[PDB]
Amino acid sequence: KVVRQSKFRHVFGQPVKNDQCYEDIRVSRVTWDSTFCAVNPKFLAVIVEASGGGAFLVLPLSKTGRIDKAYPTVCGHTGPVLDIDWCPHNDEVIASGSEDCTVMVWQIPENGLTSPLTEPVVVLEGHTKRVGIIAWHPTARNVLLSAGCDNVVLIWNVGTAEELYRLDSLHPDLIYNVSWNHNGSLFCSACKDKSVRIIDPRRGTLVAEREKAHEGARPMRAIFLADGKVFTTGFSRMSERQLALWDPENLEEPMALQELDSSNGALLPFYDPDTSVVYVCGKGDSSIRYFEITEEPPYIHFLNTFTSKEPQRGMGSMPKRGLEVSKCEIARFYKLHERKCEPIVMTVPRKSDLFQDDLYPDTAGPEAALEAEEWVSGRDADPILISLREAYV
Amino acid sequence: ASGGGAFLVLPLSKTGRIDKAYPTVCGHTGPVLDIDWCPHNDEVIASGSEDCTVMVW
Amino acid sequence: AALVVDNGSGMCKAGFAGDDAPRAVFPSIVGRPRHQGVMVKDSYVGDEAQSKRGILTLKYPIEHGIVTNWDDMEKIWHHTFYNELRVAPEEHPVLLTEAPLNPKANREKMTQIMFETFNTPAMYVAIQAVLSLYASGRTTGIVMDSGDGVTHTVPIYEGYALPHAILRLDLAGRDLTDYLMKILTERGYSFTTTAEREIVRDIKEKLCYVALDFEQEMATAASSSSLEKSYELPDGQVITIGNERFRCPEALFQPSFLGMESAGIHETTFNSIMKCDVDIRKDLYANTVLSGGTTMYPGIADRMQKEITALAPSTMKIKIIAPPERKYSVWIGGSILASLSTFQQMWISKQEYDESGPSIVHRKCF
Amino acid sequence: AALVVDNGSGMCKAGFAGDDAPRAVFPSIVGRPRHQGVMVKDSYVGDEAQSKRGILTLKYPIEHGIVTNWDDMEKIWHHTFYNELRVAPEEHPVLLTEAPLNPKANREKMTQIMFETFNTPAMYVAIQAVLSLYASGRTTGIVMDSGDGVTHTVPIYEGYALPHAILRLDLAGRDLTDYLMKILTERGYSFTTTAEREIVRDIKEKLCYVALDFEQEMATAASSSSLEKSYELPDGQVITIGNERFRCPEALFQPSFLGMESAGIHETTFNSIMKCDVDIRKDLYANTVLSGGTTMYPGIADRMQKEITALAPSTMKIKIIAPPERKYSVWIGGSILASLSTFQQMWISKQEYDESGPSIVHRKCF
Amino acid sequence: AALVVDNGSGMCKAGFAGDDAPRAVFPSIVGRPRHQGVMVKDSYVGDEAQSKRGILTLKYPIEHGIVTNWDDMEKIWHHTFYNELRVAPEEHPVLLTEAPLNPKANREKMTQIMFETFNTPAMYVAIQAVLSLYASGRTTGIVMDSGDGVTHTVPIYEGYALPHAILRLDLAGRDLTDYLMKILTERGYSFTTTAEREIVRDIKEKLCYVALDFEQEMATAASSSSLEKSYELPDGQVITIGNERFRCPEALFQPSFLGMESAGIHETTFNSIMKCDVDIRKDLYANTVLSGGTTMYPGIADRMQKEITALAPSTMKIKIIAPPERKYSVWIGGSILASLSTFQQMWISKQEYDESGPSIVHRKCF
Numbered sequence A: 001k002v003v004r005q006s007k008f009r010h011v012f013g014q015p016v017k018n019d020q021c022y023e024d025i026r027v028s029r030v031t032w033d034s035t036f037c038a039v040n041p042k043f044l045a046v047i048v049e050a051s052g053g054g055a056f057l058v059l060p061l062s063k064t065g066r067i068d069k070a071y072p073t074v075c076g077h078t079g080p081v082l083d084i085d086w087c088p089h090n091d092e093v094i095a096s097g098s099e100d101c102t103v104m105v106w107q108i109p110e111n112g113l114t115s116p117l118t119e120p121v122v123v124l125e126g127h128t129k130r131v132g133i134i135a136w137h138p139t140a141r142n143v144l145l146s147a148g149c150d151n152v153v154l155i156w157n158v159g160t161a162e163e164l165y166r167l168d169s170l171h172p173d174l175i176y177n178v179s180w181n182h183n184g185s186l187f188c189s190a191c192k193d194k195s196v197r198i199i200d201p202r203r204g205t206l207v208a209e210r211e212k213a214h215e216g217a218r219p220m221r222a223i224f225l226a227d228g229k230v231f232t233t234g235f236s237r238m239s240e241r242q243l244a245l246w247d248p249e250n251l252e253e254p255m256a257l258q259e260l261d262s263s264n265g266a267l268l269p270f271y272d273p274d275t276s277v278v279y280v281c282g283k284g285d286s287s288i289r290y291f292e293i294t295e296e297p298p299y300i301h302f303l304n305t306f307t308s309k310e311p312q313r314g315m316g317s318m319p320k321r322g323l324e325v326s327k328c329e330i331a332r333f334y335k336l337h338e339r340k341c342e343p344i345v346m347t348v349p350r351k352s353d354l355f356q357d358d359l360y361p362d363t364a365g366p367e368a369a370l371e372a373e374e375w376v377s378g379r380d381a382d383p384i385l386i387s388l389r390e391a392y393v
Numbered sequence B: 001a002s003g004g005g006a007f008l009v010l011p012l013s014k015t016g017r018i019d020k021a022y023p024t025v026c027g028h029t030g031p032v033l034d035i036d037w038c039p040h041n042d043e044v045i046a047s048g049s050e051d052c053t054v055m056v057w
Numbered sequence C, D, E: 001a002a003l004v005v006d007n008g009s010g011m012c013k014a015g016f017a018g019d020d021a022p023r024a025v026f027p028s029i030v031g032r033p034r035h036q037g038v039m040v041k042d043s044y045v046g047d048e049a050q051s052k053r054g055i056l057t058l059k060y061p062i063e064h065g066i067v068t069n070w071d072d073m074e075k076i077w078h079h080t081f082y083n084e085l086r087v088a089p090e091e092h093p094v095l096l097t098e099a100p101l102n103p104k105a106n107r108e109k110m111t112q113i114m115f116e117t118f119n120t121p122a123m124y125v126a127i128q129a130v131l132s133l134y135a136s137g138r139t140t141g142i143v144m145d146s147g148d149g150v151t152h153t154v155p156i157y158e159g160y161a162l163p164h165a166i167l168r169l170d171l172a173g174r175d176l177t178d179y180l181m182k183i184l185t186e187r188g189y190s191f192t193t194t195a196e197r198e199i200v201r202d203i204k205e206k207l208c209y210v211a212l213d214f215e216q217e218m219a220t221a222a223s224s225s226s227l228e229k230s231y232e233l234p235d236g237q238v239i240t241i242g243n244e245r246f247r248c249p250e251a252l253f254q255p256s257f258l259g260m261e262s263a264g265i266h267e268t269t270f271n272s273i274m275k276c277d278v279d280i281r282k283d284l285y286a287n288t289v290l291s292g293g294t295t296m297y298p299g300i301a302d303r304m305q306k307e308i309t310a311l312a313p314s315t316m317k318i319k320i321i322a323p324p325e326r327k328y329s330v331w332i333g334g335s336i337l338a339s340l341s342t343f344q345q346m347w348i349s350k351q352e353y354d355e356s357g358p359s360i361v362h363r364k365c366f
């Protein structure tokens, strides 16, 4: 009718109190545009500035307030750490890419770190240039993706330190990001030649490709959605930041194409498949805009914008298993400043204090669906769904 | 009520101007919607409120 | 088809979004019979109360911008939807207007009545001073809105409001009507009833004006009969008034005529500009927008220009913008806003309000 | 028998050196009649203006620590000597108090009036922050003196002042009174006159407090009636306030409530310590002294302790010293100083001033 | 077509190599809104922030020569290339400038952004003091560069720099602006917001000067009105200042006015020459070059000549070289360097940086 039917038109962001923040954290000073922050329902990982080599700060979620300057960090890389990603099936396992052209997988003790962690579980050596892209497989166990600056994508089995697949002749220029699809059979990628590519790793073929998805020369991002579409952020020829929805079955024209502003800094999309809400956080921006991706035109529907007065250097997002369901919380973002990590709570205003069934469907669980040996054979499975009603208090 | 919900119970003899700080029955966290005295007990009253609860006093 | 309803202390302007003028403009009054019926309806609203006011006691549900009786306030809204506009309120989104620094308790009752009593599908509440700036095609300027209940000065710069600089004056049209009734007794005419308030208000809207120099105008009225005007009462009796024509609007600039300690509308506007940052005062001096019915006196813009020029520095350019349709500027700005494509994201649905409450209305609105 | 006069923007505290409390405490106001006398004194000062304020226009000669009218400033001093203390000023040496970083032109007028108008035999001007440190028996510590006009943070170490680290906040008691009037209109209570400003100030001194956690207190006030208090107006009418009790003092920690760009009193104190040498900050953290009437809110010391602890390093011991008599710490410290035997060398005689001028007052004083 | 970007703490000077003046000179500020928009861009850079500063909170991304926020530092560079010069940075080699004794971590971030974020084909970072010596046509002399953030004294002899004799003074243009705001409150003018910082900086650049003899100037200002100047604020209000004109730049020679323990710019320059070898001090006394906007006060060269002459031996010839374009000496010396033929061997290609890293930038550069 007059108002478009939705549940998230009034989602508002709220930063936590100062005692619930993480101060005195020397956030990294790397120009590479990653999230710098990786958070699971257990620990908070922030890429920090190490005096020598590379390191990132792993600290429990309870460890709030000012952090000791001599707090033990995960300092194992000889070059600055570029990307970090928690394992979706193990809250104590995190992979890290650095400028020393290697990927290291770490095991964090349950109570955190008491002494600095220098030796990892496995050192994955296969890239010739710096590794700035890391993405765990959503369903297959111990399957990790890494994409370096040598324009090659590698699929690893962390359990055996083996290289499952090498995809070198598919990206002619610098790779921006790599995002798996829902079940984990395909992954999309944005490249410096303004091309968005959909690739099947187990067959080494190019499923689909759209050349010049965005006309500008500034970086792009491309992520897969739950329904099987591609949401992209980029710049137009007039240096205007854009959002675009793509149908992989028909990439002639984008389903939607909206312009946001004319600011710099890449737009990092944070997709929530349970709510079909994409949170767009620009590097150097002070605002967070969220959009709802539906089937009704114009498909991309602007919800609202959380505004602040401090520009964000990084941004982490808490998965569904760590959110406070009893308070109608649908997203929590750990905004990184230059010396502080400030959690921001996204909440759906509801008069009721009971459990909201429509807000919290079954989310992906911490239990893997397949394994590395079964996924190589060609098996495809959906992520195992759990319930969030048990988390209600 | 400034916050939550309340209803004023005053004896029938208590006529005239009522004190602004006169004690009220303010146990609800939301505004009170309906009140009803017990037909078998002139000192028991039930109240419904926007906090989705029914309190008997 | 969105509805734009502008409820003031004296008049209720209502119509449809996209039009140029309100289709329904009627007094916001409720009249009740004060005699006993002897020949074989207990309340009248708006113009039907104005035509039977000889046997009615007239009450304004809004006094000084404050709703004194919400039961009579619902009669105004029910009369607006069903009698004046003749629409079903559950089929049209309604854009409402609110005074500056409006209490949240007042906005919650307005939102609760629209969604629960009239069952409107969508709703939004806009600030009246912002809508008056939409009608003039500006994003910067200080709006001096003087209606029937209260006077406000709201500075806005580049689309940003300065709430700490918003000043209020408990002196508007209804206080000038009561002052005209008082000084009309000095001439021999006695108006006391509520039905005679509407007669004096009609004398004020037709014969009163603002003098450029008050003391010179008082001297001209004392040595000549050129300023005298006649007015015909409903019963055919004709009255004549002289200096009361410009003495009544003079209370806007000298509130001491009413025993008030506050400053005039010219100093209230100047003091509101001085509460703003020094770097935006120059644009506020050149964009002083007048709004409301109490700004419809002949010669009020030249007097406002002269008084602020005497207060402001000599290098500032004082420019009083008084559009000829500023009596409906709030509604016209609402009809402009409710028709924009960028505004359709501001509607608050009835389904959203039932599950979330008035918290989504305190956000989204200002 | 030396006199100790503590003139502030709001209250004037006077008495005799050696006593434990000021003998005369009256508002620093001058009231003038705003009506016409019809039955067969053109100004009132202090408590006599506070008892006739219904027919007076009340003005403060000091605004934001700046004397706006020296004619009314001399009325306060004449009312102090002859009406309150009932002494002859030409027989007692007077110890005056001055704000930190006081302009020399302001100190010269103060010294000139005391010697030429009142003909005092001796005189001395002391810094209010230093006197507040005498009252607590310390030579090291940062004094946060918040009165009625302005707020200052003055660090002192081993009897040495650090003037480069003195910070000022144009936000004190009078700005909280004006903000309380603004948020009381959101509840249906209209206070607009200068006589009603003294009523709102009395509501603030009796019912306002500082919340330890502001957002938690807002949620408690929104779901309960336990935080609501009643207040009887001079005419018997009773008003009831809820969250306005802790929202008004919250502007001290969030000046953005007043549209101000500055920082709260907790960050102003922290920034003043950070402007000092690193080797003295440890003693300033453990000796934070509160002074003035604006520091008399219940729970302001625990909130000040909680906020500075979040800003300071974890190894520093934050200790807020809030004596229960800190409303008169400036006067008490002056009565202590004017009685010391090592102070009689600091008096400036009237004979010395007539032959030398204010240059001997700029020296000797700080 | 090589670009020459001169990024300082207060101003950003950019242009093309070969020209005689920077084409783009804008403030290095980032402004963000501090009010809520009420009418249907989250940051402003440079002059677009200076024109809307009334509703913005202005921040300098560089403080004391230290980048306090690199996200806002990139907004300055993006505004330089795309809004001021309107060029594509991937098509022009860019010559950057760095402060003396610049930390390598600061140069690595500057190089990493120009190659990865803006994708410049070539790049080079030069020392600001060496460029200021190119603009005057000298290979020997000590340059006293005083900008908005910090003051440096860099001795250079026959093209060889002496890093062990480079002295630094944490006192430049921004500290003088904050000191002028403090001593203006002594005259009755309150400037507190960041938007009023830019107003006081404009008063400083137009009315301030350096007195040859400070005590004689303080005596002339105390017995005459010849040194008083008026200044019109953006809102048309005119303020008058007297001795604050030469007291504010006096902090350059007496840092104790700011509570600082360091020595003045004259003793800092003399101490930097005495740290050099005895055989080169003679040419340094005769080639003292001034650079920066803080050296643009009227009479600063004669005062600098008078003070160093008193410190240096009587047989040395003190010669202060202050070119009338010394506000842009760093950029001019960069436009001269990037135009020479012997400089094309100093460019660092983007391909060389991607395969080698910042190690080739630590070498080649000084």
Ligand SMILES: Nc1ncnc2c1ncn2[C@@H]1O[C@H](COP(=O)(O)OP(=O)(O)O)[C@@H](O)[C@H]1O
Residues within 6 Å of the ligand: C007, C008, C009, C010, C011, C012, C146, C147, C148, C149, C172, C173, C174, C201, C204, C205, C206, C208, C291, C292, C293, C294, C295, C296, C297, C327
């Ligand atoms: N031509 C006029 N001259 C003087 N006053 C007028 C004129 N027209 C209307 N008014 C006055 O304006 C007041 C209300 O105008 P309006 O702006 O509609 O106020 P509100 O918004 O409170 O309804 C009435 O009291 C009326 O007396």
Ligand SMILES: Nc1ncnc2c1ncn2[C@@H]1O[C@H](COP(=O)(O)OP(=O)(O)O)[C@@H](O)[C@H]1O
Residues within 6 Å of the ligand: D007, D008, D009, D010, D011, D012, D146, D147, D148, D149, D173, D174, D177, D201, D204, D205, D206, D208, D291, D292, D293, D294, D295, D296, D297, D327
């Ligand atoms: N108990 C109290 N609680 C809160 N505020 C108070 C209290 N007592 C006094 N004040 C406030 O303190 C202010 C003046 O205190 P004081 O330090 O005496 O001012 P000054 O130093 O200007 O004379 C007044 O504005 C008054 O509102």
Ligand SMILES: Nc1ncnc2c1ncn2[C@@H]1O[C@H](COP(=O)(O)OP(=O)(O)O)[C@@H](O)[C@H]1O
Residues within 6 Å of the ligand: E007, E008, E009, E010, E011, E012, E146, E147, E148, E149, E172, E173, E174, E177, E201, E204, E205, E206, E291, E292, E293, E294, E295, E296, E297, E327
């Ligand atoms: N004519 C002038 N007189 C005095 N000071 C000036 C003048 N012009 C500029 N300044 C000051 O110089 C400072 C910046 O000069 P500049 O060397 O260009 O800065 P930076 O090199 O650090 O960007 C500013 O703080 C400004 O106040």
Ligand SMILES: [Mg+2]
Residues within 6 Å of the ligand: C007, C008, C009, C128, C147, C148, C292, C330
């Ligand atoms: Mg109106």
Ligand SMILES: [Mg+2]
Residues within 6 Å of the ligand: D007, D008, D009, D128, D145, D146, D147, D148, D292, D330
């Ligand atoms: Mg005081």
Ligand SMILES: [Mg+2]
Residues within 6 Å of the ligand: E008, E009, E128, E145, E146, E147, E148, E292, E330
């Ligand atoms: Mg410079």
